[PDB]
Amino acid sequence: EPQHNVMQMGGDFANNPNAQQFIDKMVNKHGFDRQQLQEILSQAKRLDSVLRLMDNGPNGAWLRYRKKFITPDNVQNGVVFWNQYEDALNRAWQVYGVPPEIIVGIIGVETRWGRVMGKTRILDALATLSFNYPRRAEYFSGELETFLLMARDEQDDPLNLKGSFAGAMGYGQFMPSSYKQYAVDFSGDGHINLWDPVDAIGSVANYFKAHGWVKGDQVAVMANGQAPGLPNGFKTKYSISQLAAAGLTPQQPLGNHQQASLLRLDVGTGYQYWYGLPNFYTITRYNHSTHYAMAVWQLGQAVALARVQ
C-alpha cells in the first residue's frame, strides 16, 4: 500500500545524503516508487572490501601473467565451451565479424567460461561505490541507475544478482552500462540475459564490433629486433618507419598498416617486441591492459589449436 509517511529507511545507507538524492533521481526520472526503493536499499550493504579493492626487469612478468590463464585445464575447458556453443560462435562471426577465438578468449579470461562469475551482490557493490566513494561516485551512481532499470526490464529481483566487486555480471562480466549499450538478445528468446552463454557470446561480439573490431584484420605481429629507446604500451603510436629506424622488422607482412603501437612483453630471458595493430587496441577496450589483451588473444589461439587435434 502507500506508506507516504515512512520517509526514512534503515540499514547501512540509512543517513546517507547520496542514497537520498539517488532515490529522488530514480523516482523523478524513472517513475520508481520511493518506498519500494527504500525497502530495496535498506537491505543493501556497505562493503569495506569493495572500497579497499577499488582503492586498487626483465623478470619474466608476461610469463607469470600468461600462465595464470594458459594452462592445460583452461585450454581443455575452452575447447569444451567452444564445441558446446559452436553455432552461437559461428553466428556471432557471421553477424559481427568477431572470430570464435576472441570471444572464447574473453569469456575464458573473465569467468573461465561461467565457472567464476562473482559472489558479491551487485546491489551492494554498486550502492557502496555510489554512496560511500566520492572519487568514482558519479560513474557508479550511473551504473546503479542502469542496474535497477535492467532488473526492472529483465524482471530480475535486484537483490538476487551476483557478480564482481565492481558490479560486473555474467559470462563476460558486463558492467550495467555495457548491458545497456552493447548487450543483445542473441539466443532469440526476447530477453537479454548476461548469464545465458548464447546472449553473452552475442553481446561480447557486439561490444567488439561497436569498439571498432575489423573483420579479418591482424591483431598484432611479433617483431624481430629490440627498440629500448622508444616508450611502449598499448597507448603508444609510431609509424612503421619510426619502428624500423628503431631496429624492428615485422615477422609477418603488415599489409597496409602505416602505424602501430609498440608492445613489449617481458619473457624472462629478455624483451619481446610486437607491432600492435588496431584490433589489439580494440581488445584493450574490454580491459585497459596489454597483458590482458595478449592473454585473451593467446588463450583463444591456444584453444583453437587444441580443437584441431
Question: Which positions are annotated as active-site residues?
Answer: 110
Residue 227: how many CA atoms within 13 Å on its side-chain side? 28
The rounded distance, in Å, linking the Cα atoms of 1 and 127 is 26
The rounded distance, in Å, linking the Cα atoms of 276 and 274 is 6
Copy the grid coordinates of residue 232: 611502449
**190: burial class by Cβ within 10 Å (0-12, 13-18, 19+)?**
exposed
Q: Mark 187-216 with x for binding to Na ion (rule: CB under 5 A) and - for no binding.
A: x-x-x-------x-----------------
Nearer to Na ion, 177 or 187 (CB): 187
The rounded distance, in Å, linking the Cα atoms of 11 and 32 is 20
Q: Going edge to edge, which strands form the sheet with 271-276? A: 238-239, 259-266, 271-276, 220-224, 249-250
* Nearest approach, Cβ of residue 171 and Na ion (Å): 13
Nearer to Na ion, 86 or 189 (CB): 189
Nearest to 102 by CA among 196, 255, 214, 5: 214
Nearer to Na ion, 33 or 189 (CB): 189
Nearer to Na ion, 68 or 191 (CB): 191
Instruction: Write the DSSP string, 282-304.
Output: HHHTTSS-HHHHHHHHHHHHHHH
Phi–psi pair at 220, nearest 5 degrees: -155, 155
Interface segment toward Na ion; rule CB under 5 A; list 77-85, 91-99, 103-111, 181-189: 181-189
Interface segment toward Na ion; rule CB under 5 A; list 30-38, 44-52, 160-168, 186-194: 186-194
- The verdict on 25 binding Na ion (CB under 5 A) reads no
* Nearest approach, Cβ of residue 184 and Na ion (Å): 8
Nearer to Na ion, 87 or 189 (CB): 189
Among 154, 156, 185, 217, binds Na ion (CB under 5 A): 185
Question: Binding-site residue total for Na ion (CB under 5 A)?
Answer: 5
Contacts of 54 (CB under 8 A, 6+ apart): 129, 133, 136, 165, 166
Angle, helices 17-30/137-153, rounded to nearest 10 degrees: 40
Would you call 114 helix, strand, or coil by DSSP? coil
* Nearest approach, Cβ of residue 286 and Na ion (Å): 21
Interface segment toward Na ion; rule CB under 5 A; list 111-119, 159-167, 177-185, 278-286: 177-185
* Nearest approach, Cβ of residue 190 and Na ion (Å): 7
Angle, helices 290-308/72-84, rounded to nearest 10 degrees: 70
* Nearest approach, Cβ of residue 189 and Na ion (Å): 4
* Nearest approach, Cβ of residue 198 and Na ion (Å): 7
Interface segment toward Na ion; rule CB under 5 A; list 39-47, 126-134, 179-187, 258-266: 179-187
Nearer to Na ion, 47 or 205 (CB): 205
List contacts with Na ion (CB under 5 A). 185, 187, 189, 191, 199
